[PDB]
Amino acid sequence: GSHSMRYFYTAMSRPGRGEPRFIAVGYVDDTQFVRFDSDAASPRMAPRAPWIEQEGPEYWDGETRNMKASAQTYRENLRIALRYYNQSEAGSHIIQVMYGCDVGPDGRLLRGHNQYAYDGKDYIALNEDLSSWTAADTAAQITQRKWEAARVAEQLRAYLEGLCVEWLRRYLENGKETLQRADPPKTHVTHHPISDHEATLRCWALGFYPAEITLTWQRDGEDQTQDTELVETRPAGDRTFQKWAAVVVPSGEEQRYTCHVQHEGLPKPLTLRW
């Protein structure tokens, strides 16, 4: 179906402990495929998925160069942000950046993304038009003005419509056995007595990929949204994800509860019961 590529950068200042650390990671959908860490003994863009390993030395050296340059830019941006927010050089701060393109099944750009945060708060974002900006605050408006003046959006649009989509298409092909394979959840319901008149029904989804999944409990065919404990989808470490949804049910009423599982790897949503 649809796919995405994302790059995420985190630049973390640490006054008195050297230059800000810069860590970048790249994802296709929910699969990390590259990393860079400026604190590594020998910093390089490094593969983190098998299907990227085939990329040649020009790719790796180019990515490494780009990451080192990006680290420098974001170290500068950290210094700039201090100014824009009237902040001390003594504090630790963080810039995060996301870039992304989403494509449809035919590989055509659905939309592009480029967003920035400072200390975990939205700073500036490229709008969906890939032409204009939304600045979160008056500091970011300074950046906006600079980026409007320099027609930065055009360069970003060029990347997002062009290389991002093209390289995503390539990765999708090279990694098709995994990137284009949904692993449906392995589902089951467990029962955990809490007391003589209540038990937890926990609906498990395991081993699924991609991460997007909907687990819902119904009681008498009514969604138990407010009464469901839903843990964050979590990585198993083998590429797949896990999630559970639990409801506390009256003893003997277990059959009034149905767990509903929606996942792209399922031809139809599953209904489960204890």
Partner: peptide, 9 residues
């Protein structure tokens, strides 16, 4: 591939 769009804030 990572973007080369390096813009100072």
């Amino acid at each position: 591939i990572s973007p080369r769009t390096l813009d100072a804030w």
